[PDB]
Design a protein around this ligand. Structure first.
Ligand SMILES: C[C@H](C[C@@H](C[C@H](C[C@@H](C[C@@H](CCN1CCCC1=O)N1CCCC1=O)N1CCCC1=O)N1CCCC1=O)N1CCCC1=O)N1CCCC1=O
Ligand SMILES: C[C@H](C[C@@H](C[C@H](C[C@@H](C[C@@H](CCN1CCCC1=O)N1CCCC1=O)N1CCCC1=O)N1CCCC1=O)N1CCCC1=O)N1CCCC1=O
Ligand SMILES: C[C@H](C[C@@H](C[C@H](C[C@@H](C[C@@H](CCN1CCCC1=O)N1CCCC1=O)N1CCCC1=O)N1CCCC1=O)N1CCCC1=O)N1CCCC1=O
Ligand SMILES: C[C@H](C[C@@H](C[C@H](C[C@@H](C[C@@H](CCN1CCCC1=O)N1CCCC1=O)N1CCCC1=O)N1CCCC1=O)N1CCCC1=O)N1CCCC1=O
Ligand SMILES: C[C@H](C[C@@H](C[C@H](C[C@@H](C[C@@H](CCN1CCCC1=O)N1CCCC1=O)N1CCCC1=O)N1CCCC1=O)N1CCCC1=O)N1CCCC1=O
Ligand SMILES: C[C@H](C[C@@H](C[C@H](C[C@@H](C[C@@H](CCN1CCCC1=O)N1CCCC1=O)N1CCCC1=O)N1CCCC1=O)N1CCCC1=O)N1CCCC1=O
Ligand SMILES: C[C@H](C[C@@H](C[C@H](C[C@@H](C[C@@H](CCN1CCCC1=O)N1CCCC1=O)N1CCCC1=O)N1CCCC1=O)N1CCCC1=O)N1CCCC1=O
Ligand SMILES: C[C@H](C[C@@H](C[C@H](C[C@@H](C[C@@H](CCN1CCCC1=O)N1CCCC1=O)N1CCCC1=O)N1CCCC1=O)N1CCCC1=O)N1CCCC1=O
Ligand SMILES: CC(C)(NC(=O)OCc1ccccc1)c1nc(C(=O)NCCc2ccncc2)c(O)c(=O)[nH]1
Ligand SMILES: CC(C)(NC(=O)OCc1ccccc1)c1nc(C(=O)NCCc2ccncc2)c(O)c(=O)[nH]1
Ligand SMILES: CC(C)(NC(=O)OCc1ccccc1)c1nc(C(=O)NCCc2ccncc2)c(O)c(=O)[nH]1
Ligand SMILES: CC(C)(NC(=O)OCc1ccccc1)c1nc(C(=O)NCCc2ccncc2)c(O)c(=O)[nH]1
Ligand SMILES: CC(C)(NC(=O)OCc1ccccc1)c1nc(C(=O)NCCc2ccncc2)c(O)c(=O)[nH]1
Ligand SMILES: CC(C)(NC(=O)OCc1ccccc1)c1nc(C(=O)NCCc2ccncc2)c(O)c(=O)[nH]1
Ligand SMILES: [Mn+2]
Ligand SMILES: [Mn+2]
Ligand SMILES: [Mn+2]
Ligand SMILES: [Mn+2]
Ligand SMILES: [Mn+2]
Ligand SMILES: [Mn+2]
Ligand SMILES: [Mn+2]
Ligand SMILES: [Mn+2]
Lengths: 181, 181, 181, 181, 181, 181, 181, 181
């Protein structure tokens, strides 16, 4: 495909570096952004949320695991575990919190926050890794009700998610995106 | 008109990005900066005040609504309301305060702070939206005497306004500007 | 409208400076790129063709008239006429050739090169202004068969036009664009 | 693999943009630069040769086909054919010469120039597409002995190839690279 | 003076580097751009003409003497004379032509080209230094009718001068500027 | 003078923007940095101290008066006074502290801190303007022993001053500089 | 040597400015990074640790002594001593802490933290200079158990060190590096 | 030495990249620019002359050998010889001319052009390598009276050399520099 409307919307909606990282990640997992365009938008959204999350809090509070190649990501995970003494997670997480000393798995869902958190928690099993779910509707849900960041940073993330939703809807792209998850 | 003295003064007085945003806003509302030059200076001044205001306080305390196209501005307004649960304002505001959780309408007047605040408050009706008026004389007036920012940030804004006034006066542009409002 | 597929395609297809100049031109003529999207793509295409044309030939062979505000454009036209002694054109042209000493009116058509050239020539009447028409199919037509530039520069322009056509077609935007002219 | 010596040598030997384009091309064809490192070096070398070749001659003499995604590459090929009237090649070429009006297939071999040219010519069949082979030893071979560029540009390319060879040899990487083709 | 309309027009009309060089030159000669504003515009115009002139022709055809501090300017003059064997001029010139091997004194006048050339030629006496006068009306006059540059470069300079004239006139600044010389 | 050793040392010792501001200030006061080189070094040192001082404390705690043209400097002074209600100083100060609400006059001396403070205090008379003197030996002295900034920022300034002293001494420039004040 | 695998790994592993500073330091001490490659990696690692350390804490808390030429480094040391009154250290340290008012000697070891600290403390004798040792295994050791920085900054440094270790190991470079110290 | 007047003059006289390359070259040959300052100025001058020389002529006419580390320089020399078939020079040259197919050894002397050319020619013996000597007085001398470049490029180089001479003289540095060779 030379180009879809979802792909053009993604390129005009997200920062170029985020788009390139999403393209690299999908191609690394044998996915084509030109064909799997809803997945493309999903990777971009998850990446941007991760970056805004890391931008919340102190200057070097978080180590960003997402947005790297899985080799480098696992290298940084091993280094964090071997210096802090934290259990090596079974699946690759999104961030590491040096303040709370724990890995963070970030989720962005078009369903109910409750469903996706249940899914992620069943996946990781190891309750050591903190979970934080955001929805496009504005709800959020974190392990032990410990939301890690300030209310204002989380509010910025939720506002951004709702803007993305409105933008997709105005282009008649939101319904397929919502049903795709 | 190939150029007026007010337009040249505006271009040498305000930052280029602020000038471009003011030009876009006026042209979006069917106004010509080359002809309506006092309005041009007014849009530039209001924009710069809004930006300095947002620069006061924390890094991401404010969401800037002014300086966008009204479509994007209303999109961001809808997102803020639908994530925070705040009443949708009848008229487009200037900022959103994530700390105090409220929209802000900024005003810059050449009259008395009292007159312009009365006008703006009669306009919005919805007392939910905070009002903050600055004058070129150095006075200020905010809803519930809650001035939102530090004294030093407000002082910077007032100093800038007085510098703009002096600069216009030295070019014999201040009298027409003052009588234009 | 918060966004159409033609608008997103335009933003991903053309350079940002060209997009901004097209937006300024349309808004100056009371047109909205968010609504009149085929016109948006047309202004961007015409602008890019003009810029590539000026980039053909010597370093400072051409004076670019298109892409300015009509006040500045007419100022430069008056200067060119009052220094070279060339007849002031009735309608604003696109370029001035210092080598051949003549104004150039560039056209890009989705119809037949012949039809659009007839239209432009009937418009200007003053045969002093050279006409050069390009089509999306790859044909071209210039006054007195004097094509001004090298074959290779014209070939680059025609290739670019055909790429734009293919890109629009793959997004199902080409048919409405073609029927819009 | 977290990293090989060939990969580190490639990253220190070639420009970053060339490295990124090679990585994209291999991943697009289901190849991993971290594992297939000799192929990695080969893609980087071929890309750099193509870019130097295009930099020979006039400013816009060549249209660069290599270094794009095959969708965009074939789009540009279709545009070139549909504007010039040239036969659509069966396989994607490397460049298009607007001066000589023909597609160019560039080859870089560690064997004898003669062997690789025979292979490429048997591949394309369509004698319309010009062939130009460079070797790491400094020899070259072009269709109809028409070498397209100046002697000095070709000399620059050959010098660069020999420098790459020496650099690989000093790191004991040249023998495996040579036997890999 | 905090600012005049001529000064604001100068700052919006000329490139910032040219403005800074003019300010430095005037202050070096005990002149204040804020007060002597017509002189300010004149220095900016003469500087821009000199730069466009040097930009005509080959890459390193001209050595630019104007726009330096007189110490460095005379140092470069001495070097040019002591390497080429050319007579040291009594007054500082504007350029040196390595092609024609001669110093150039550039003039921009609001009077008749003839008057100003007579004045400059009486000044230098040494007929070795070439003279080239431009007017705001579009006329030009060079020693021995040897105009040094192409017609197209000179045409660009004349067009620019006429644009400056129109811009000043639209702001009612041209009459005082014209009568000031 | 084409150049002294003090001037070359100044250009290699201080940041280029600081050098340009010092040159502008001296030329504005009819001083030549090429001749009055010890004064040149003194202006650069005073400027750098002022900038480091303003960089101490909060982001927008200080309004920088030094390093502007006296017209703009007095304009900003008038604005600060007319918005805060502070007495207009008889002589132009260096900074304004929005936190402590007072103007600051910074001094850098090669004599004893006590002598220079006595001189400055006799000069200003108006005890409203805070005084803060630094020496090249590392001593400091502020009005009412209120040193305004943290100990660490002042320590940075003193270290820088001593480095400047050592650098001048190693070039045999310090003795004349010390005796020049 | 035209290049080793350790040198290529160093160039791809560390920031270019850090690489250049390490090269300058070694060449200043008569060392060749192309030959003494384990020393090259060690200088780069020590430099990066010093820079991360200085980046911990306040904006201007630390004066960086390492990464300068020893002449400038000793000049800054003399200035710090002559302004704070601190004993001049016998050997050049790495940093100065303006908060704790003391020089810091940073060490990075592949042995046990205890051994290297004993060595450094025997070296300096003057107990005035604080010592802080990091290991590639993640341990650390500071004088008087006063670790100067936050736990999170130290954790970042330890994670980086372990990543460097893993990267060297994957290239079979870690064993020789470890045995080289 | 913390700094000499020759070193400060060198840093203010030559471009920073040229200064860094000269520093690297001297330190690579066990020379200290802070002590051997006349040699420092000589390396900078020779480097700048080489760069201006390479900038004469076509875009990629010359391969620059000077300004590299001798390992890379000899690598490029070997590549040039092994692709062109030119005799490997006994001593490292300065440039390679792809047009004339020969290595160039550039010299800059404070003596007579004749003496230094005799010295260089006795050194290389291999008459294959072209010699081109420039003097600070403005004379020049090339093998077989073949001066390779245009008269205007050579004139630019000679003018620059004379400017350097005047600048050194005004600082009383020229006599020691002249007697040092
Ligand atoms: C470190 C670097 C890239 C970072 C990605 C991340 C991006 C960051 C950029 C900031 C500035 N903002 C904010 C406004 C716009 C912008 O641009 N934000 C945050 C918000 C959106 C965004 O874009 N950050 C964080 C540190 C600095 C930086 O840039 N990444 C990518 C994955 C790992 C990582 O740390 N790296 C590291 C090596 C490869 C690379 O690219
Ligand atoms: C975000 C971006 C532009 C921002 C406008 C605003 C400008 C800001 C720039 C800062 C840096 N300073 C300060 C010194 C000079 C300067 O330059 N300030 C504040 C003071 C004056 C000024 O200029 N800000 C704030 C965030 C970063 C940024 O740049 N705007 C424009 C409207 C919406 C918005 O957020 N965006 C967003 C998309 C379009 C665009 O342009
Ligand atoms: C002069 C300046 C803008 C020019 C517009 C035009 C754009 C030019 C840019 C070049 C570089 N390339 C080529 C590769 C990508 C790129 O970027 N090209 C040509 C091809 C596409 C493109 O983009 N040119 C030509 C001169 C330099 C320049 O930039 N314009 C705008 C209208 C009038 C004008 O002269 N001006 C003048 C004042 C306002 C402004 O913006
Ligand atoms: C156009 C742009 C990238 C180009 C790639 C190519 C690179 C070019 C860069 C030049 C400058 N030099 C020379 C010195 C170092 C440097 O940097 N050279 C040539 C030599 C090595 C090199 O790097 N060129 C040529 C035009 C301008 C440009 O940059 N490409 C990539 C594939 C298609 C294409 O045209 N594009 C187009 C869209 C995506 C993108 O990236
Ligand atoms: C060399 C440098 C400055 C030059 C001044 C001159 C400016 C030149 C810039 C070009 C690019 N263009 C063209 C488009 C806009 C732009 O910017 N043009 C020419 C047209 C208008 C303009 O601006 N040139 C010529 C060489 C490169 C350069 O920049 N000058 C100043 C006096 C002496 C000199 O050679 N120098 C030298 C040392 C101090 C300094 O500043
Ligand atoms: C605002 C701007 C210039 C400022 C001068 C001052 C310089 C500042 C720069 C910072 C960054 N650092 C720090 C590291 C190196 C560097 O570069 N520091 C402080 C330390 C030395 C230095 O250089 N500041 C402060 C605000 C941002 C800025 O740049 N000035 C000049 C006089 C008035 C003024 O506010 N302005 C305003 C209009 C004209 C102009 O130039
Ligand atoms: C000051 C300057 C260079 C500094 C070196 C140091 C580098 C700093 C750069 C920052 C930004 N980050 C962080 C992200 C990537 C990056 O780039 N960090 C810290 C982490 C790694 C890194 O790179 N710092 C600190 C002040 C600003 C600066 O750049 N140095 C070199 C030795 C002395 C010194 O102060 N100087 C001073 C004169 C010569 C020179 O080069
Ligand atoms: C290629 C690159 C550096 C080059 C050095 C040389 C410098 C060139 C820069 C030009 C632009 N101008 C001209 C005006 C000011 C300026 O800046 N000129 C020529 C005149 C003075 C100057 O500075 N050139 C030539 C090609 C592009 C470039 O930059 N060198 C260094 C040695 C080998 C080499 O090719 N490389 C290559 C790898 C390392 C590196 O640094
Ligand atoms: C958005 C995405 C892929 N949705 C999803 O299906 O979840 C898969 C997942 C995987 C691991 C942990 C938790 C969930 C997602 N990916 C990750 C992620 O970590 N690595 C995937 C990198 C990638 C990117 C693009 N294509 C394939 C792979 C998330 O952490 C996350 O939250 N969402
Ligand atoms: C400076 C200005 C326009 N003066 C004014 O007449 O008030 C109109 C107003 C509108 C909404 C709320 C409150 C007041 C002004 N505009 C806004 C603003 O929000 N959107 C207007 C964008 C625009 C810019 C230029 N032209 C037309 C429209 C302000 O908020 C504000 O304070 N002042
Ligand atoms: C693409 C466009 C507008 N199509 C068209 O309808 O022709 C109108 C036209 C006008 C003058 C001469 C010849 C033709 C076009 N505009 C111009 C042009 O010069 N100024 C128009 C600036 C503008 C841009 C956007 N909206 C309104 C106005 C062309 O020269 C050209 O070729 N095409
Ligand atoms: C370094 C200097 C000039 N030494 C001095 O003789 O004091 C004169 C002075 C003037 C006003 C208040 C206090 C002292 C100095 N100048 C200023 C200053 O404000 N404006 C002078 C701008 C200038 C720059 C260069 N040349 C002439 C004028 C200082 O504030 C300061 O401390 N030192
Ligand atoms: C990594 C290194 C060199 N390993 C080491 O053998 O220690 C020598 C040392 C020297 C002084 C104090 C403490 C230890 C090291 N150098 C320094 C350092 O300060 N100046 C050396 C600059 C240099 C760089 C490269 N080659 C030669 C010299 C350290 O402070 C440190 O910790 N490690
Ligand atoms: C300016 C210099 C060093 N004067 C000189 O004594 O001549 C020595 C020489 C060497 C080879 C061929 C011809 C002459 C000079 N160096 C070179 C040069 O090539 N490599 C030297 C790199 C270097 C830089 C700094 N320190 C030590 C070595 C020249 O080519 C040249 O002309 N002058
Ligand atoms: Mn996740
Ligand atoms: Mn408002
Ligand atoms: Mn047209
Ligand atoms: Mn190929
Ligand atoms: Mn002149
Ligand atoms: Mn002061
Ligand atoms: Mn250390
Ligand atoms: Mn040489």
């Amino acid at each position: 495909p030379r180009g879809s409307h979802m792909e053009d919307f993604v390129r005009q909606c997200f920062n170029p570096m985020i788009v390139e990282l999403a393209e690299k990640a999908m191609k690394e997992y044998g996915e084509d952004p030109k064909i799997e365009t809803n997945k493309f938008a999903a990777i971009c959204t998850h990446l941007e949320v991760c970056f805004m999350y890391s931008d919340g809090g102190s200057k070097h509070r978080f180590e960003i695991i997402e947005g790297r190649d899985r080799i480098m990501a696992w290298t940084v995970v091993n280094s964090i575990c071997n210096t802090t003494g934290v259990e090596k997670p079974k699946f690759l997480p999104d961030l590491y919190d040096y303040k709370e000393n724990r890995f963070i798995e970030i989720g962005v869902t078009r369903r109910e926050v409750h469903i996706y958190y249940l899914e992620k928690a069943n996946k990781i099993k190891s309750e050591k890794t903190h979970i934080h779910i955001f929805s496009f509707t504005g709800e959020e849900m974190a392990t032990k009700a410990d939301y890690t960041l300030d209310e204002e940073s989380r509010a910025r993330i939720k506002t951004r998610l709702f803007t993305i939703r409105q933008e997709m809807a105005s282009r008649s792209l939101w319904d397929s995106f919502r049903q795709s998850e």
